[PDB]
Amino acid sequence: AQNPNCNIMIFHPTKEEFNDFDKYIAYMESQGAHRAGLAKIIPPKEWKARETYDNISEILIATPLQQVASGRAGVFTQYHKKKKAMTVGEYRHLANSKKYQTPPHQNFEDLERKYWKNRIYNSPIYGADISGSLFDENTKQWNLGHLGTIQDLLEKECGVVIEGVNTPYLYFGMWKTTFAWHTEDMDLYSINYLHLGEPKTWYVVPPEHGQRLERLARELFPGSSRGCGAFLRHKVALISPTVLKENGIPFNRITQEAGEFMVTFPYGYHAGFNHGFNCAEAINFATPRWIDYGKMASQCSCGEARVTFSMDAFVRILQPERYDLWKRGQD
Ligand SMILES: O=C(O)CNC(=O)C(=O)O
Numbered sequence: 001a002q003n004p005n006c007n008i009m010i011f012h013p014t015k016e017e018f019n020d021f022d023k024y025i026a027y028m029e030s031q032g033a034h035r036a037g038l039a040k041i042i043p044p045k046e047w048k049a050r051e052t053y054d055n056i057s058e059i060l061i062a063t064p065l066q067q068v069a070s071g072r073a074g075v076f077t078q079y080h081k082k083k084k085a086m087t088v089g090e091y092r093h094l095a096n097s098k099k100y101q102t103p104p105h106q107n108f109e110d111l112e113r114k115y116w117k118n119r120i121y122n123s124p125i126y127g128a129d130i131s132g133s134l135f136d137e138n139t140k141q142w143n144l145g146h147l148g149t150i151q152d153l154l155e156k157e158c159g160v161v162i163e164g165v166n167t168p169y170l171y172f173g174m175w176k177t178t179f180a181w182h183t184e185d186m187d188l189y190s191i192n193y194l195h196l197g198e199p200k201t202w203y204v205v206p207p208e209h210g211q212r213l214e215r216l217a218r219e220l221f222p223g224s225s226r227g228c229g230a231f232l233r234h235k236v237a238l239i240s241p242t243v244l245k246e247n248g249i250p251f252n253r254i255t256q257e258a259g260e261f262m263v264t265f266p267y268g269y270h271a272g273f274n275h276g277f278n279c280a281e282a283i284n285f286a287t288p289r290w291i292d293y294g295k296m297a298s299q300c301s302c303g304e305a306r307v308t309f310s311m312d313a314f315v316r317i318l319q320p321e322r323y324d325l326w327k328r329g330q331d
Pocket residue numbers: 171178179190191192264280282283
């Protein structure tokens with residue numbers, strides 16, 4: 001078995017190998033990359049997402065989210081308070097202000113220490129889940145706005161035509177902005193490209209060990225657990241690496257820098273934080289190997305997780321018994 005210790009793998013495709021997206025994902029899996037839950041892909045040196053970022057300041061962040069924490073430094077939840085709209089240029093100025101900017105630090109490890117020590121005492125503002133793309137339309141390779149769609153994959157594998165569309169989302173981050181422990185909707189893959197700015201640190205649990213994370217989460221968030229049988233779908237809970245280590249949960253960590261892709265694999269729990277002002281783009285995708293994960297994916301039916309139009313069809317076709325109760329949650 002390849003990559004039996006479930007380490008995060010880093011790949012360096014040539015421009016020739018960067019032509020066929022599906023093929024390269026299958027290659028990475030042939031080397032065991034999926035076992036980690038997360039992989040890094042460094043694009044060929046000749047490749048670019050677009051010519052410059054000089055003209056992005058007038059993108060609107062219609063609903064910036066202030067991420068307010070409750071709990072203890074290593075075990076907390078966050079809620080998102082909606083703020084007034086601002087442009088990317090306004091947000092970047094805010095991120096660089098004395099109140100919100102990255103503190104002085106020695107290296108990524110020192111900054112990681114400061115994050116876990118101090119995150120709960122601040123409420124950074126996140127521009128998340130903004131439909132759109134920063135890839136130039138002429139970028140032919142690994143353009144996240146030109147991927148094959150999950151509906152087309154399901155149709156190719158299973159023969160059923162379904163409604164729904166699949167488009168990318170932009171994320172504008174600042175120091176301490178946080179992504180809670182989650183897997184993707186319907187335990188899909190994701191791909192994330194860091195277009196610009198400061199790094200993003202990731203934590204991930206191997207798919208084969210995901211239930212160990214879930215059992216810890218039920219112990220650490222006991223009222224949330226009683227409220228919903230899949231409360232990590234709410235995307236609100238954080239657990240530090242120190243706490244994971246104290247409880248024997250297998251995980252790995254890596255820092256993504258501007259110009260790099262990350263791929264998350266089906267049922268790979270992940271969480272993380274941004275180091276400073278940055279912009280990422282991400283989208284879900286599927287392969288044939290995903291279908292079995294989609295069939296088995298947990299669902300939130302308490303009503304909190306409330307997700308896309310396109311997830312309907314996935315539940316209806318892959319999980320017809322759940323369909324009924326899940327849609328009661330979504331209506
Ligand atoms: O970058 C972020 O804030 C969150 N991204 C992801 O969870 C992803 O790409 O799967």
